[PDB]
Symmetry: C3
Subunit: 48 residues, 3 copies
Amino acid sequence: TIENSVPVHLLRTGDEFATGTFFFDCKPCRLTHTWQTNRALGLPPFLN
Amino acid sequence: GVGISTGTFNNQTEFKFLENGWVEITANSSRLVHLNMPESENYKRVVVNNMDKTAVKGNMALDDIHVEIVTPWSLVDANAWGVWFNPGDWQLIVNTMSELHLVSFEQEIFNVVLKTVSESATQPPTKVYNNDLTASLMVALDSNNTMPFTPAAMRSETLGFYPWKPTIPTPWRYYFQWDRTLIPSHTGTSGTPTNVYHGTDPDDVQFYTIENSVPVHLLRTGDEFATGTFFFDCKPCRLTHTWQTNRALGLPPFLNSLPQSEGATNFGDIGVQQDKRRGVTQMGNTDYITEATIMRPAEVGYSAPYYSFEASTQGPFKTPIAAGRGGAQTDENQAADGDPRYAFGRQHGQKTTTTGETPERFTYIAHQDTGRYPEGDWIQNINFNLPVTNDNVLLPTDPIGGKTGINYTNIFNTYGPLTALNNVPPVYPNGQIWDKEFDTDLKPRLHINAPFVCQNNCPGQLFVKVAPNLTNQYDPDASANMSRIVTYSDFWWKGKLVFKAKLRASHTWNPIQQMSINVDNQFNYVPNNIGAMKIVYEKSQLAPRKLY
Amino acid sequence: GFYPWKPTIPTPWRYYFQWDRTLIPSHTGTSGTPTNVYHGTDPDDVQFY
């Protein structure tokens, strides 16, 4: 129950509300993709 | 410049004991490398089809189709054990230390020599070797690890394990995105299955170039080059093996009855019933508390599919396994707990004075016991109600999928958040030392080819090449091929690898398994009348360690 | 003992020693004698505390 478990704000026209700034905790997101399997790993054979 | 020497030779193994049982080992390997002129001074892109072995409808693990790009650049790998220690040093480490910490690594190249070959077509004809004192060598270092990583241990394209023996770098090459499809097929599967090489995904096209992406150094005789010191980041390597399963964990039963005399047939009997024994089990059905039933804190090692030849966009590939042993001696599943296999020749083991061209190998079998005998398991009913009945138990012998050869053992994967594990021990010589780490957000717990993985930073690849020596005729407006002066160059390479370890104390009463020289070993560690040398493989972790 | 006003007893100490074995499953029907033996001990894994 929201009424029971959280502070409620009544805003009228003249009012306004603002959350402050929240900082997240998260590992970065990469904008790259891996195209390597198990057959594209290491030193390929030597072509005689 | 050209008179004078640039470096010194040192292939010495130094051990410096510190305080509180810590030693600081520094292995030096100064080998003299030889290198010839790259045939093409151009980069290639070659495709390999062997669509004549992958048609026999039986042959699917023999898929040698990949795509590589050849580089005129010749690489140099020293990421091996055999290249550092000798059978006499390894004994010291392995018999007396208990853990190893890889530290520093620094390479140094000196006494560069470049000679031209003059072919005097006269009778024989004859060959006249000279020195082109103005010639050059193109040394390069990928200090910012920008290029792929090709550990040349995998394919025994390392450096000689005998210092007094001149060696050769490996022609550099790397992978290029090759796309394929190949469906399995036994000897009977009717029709033509499916297998093709579409080509390349335009997305995954990475065409590297050393000239473009790395600072190149030209060294003349008078010059020299030195990498500085690189520090690794790696968890220590243990020189101990675990011999404890799930039946050798905790407080054994209390034997109400003990033998009253000698005989390997006088067993101490507990003296209580299985369905009236006190303790804890992970069952809510039974009342039977057995050495197989009782609840153990966790599970040692895991059980995975064998010969689970998976596949993706590049083609089928086997499923790795981190295993130890798992059976009576010469009573193992060589493939169930994944036992490495090593093939080298002449320059990395094997009898120097051999003939023909056939690699020699060994199937290294550790000492740790985390492996399994997938030939003594079973899946039965929640009803238990033993003695278990056929229709109530799936055994190894019982086929799955209707085919004989197959099992549930073959398709089985018991890896739980309760799986305990020990990394892959060093396999010396041959075996690898340290191996880069995957750039995937999620990373493998441990590598199967090397005990040390450097995470945040690894030393860069040393690419060694010969500079084009040109004649009086050269038209860059001619395909031909920059006919050049047949040039090669010989240079001395030196290495300083640093390891820091701790010493083993005794805690038992029974001696521990050590390394020695038998009447069977002797001549495996000494040259012969002709000078036939060779380096045998030898178990690393041979010393107990209590798991729990 | 879980009852304080009740005198208790320690447990005779004992621990494991490397024992090597083989045992293959077998239902009530599996024909013949399957396989099960106790070779002994691997000389490598001998810890006598």
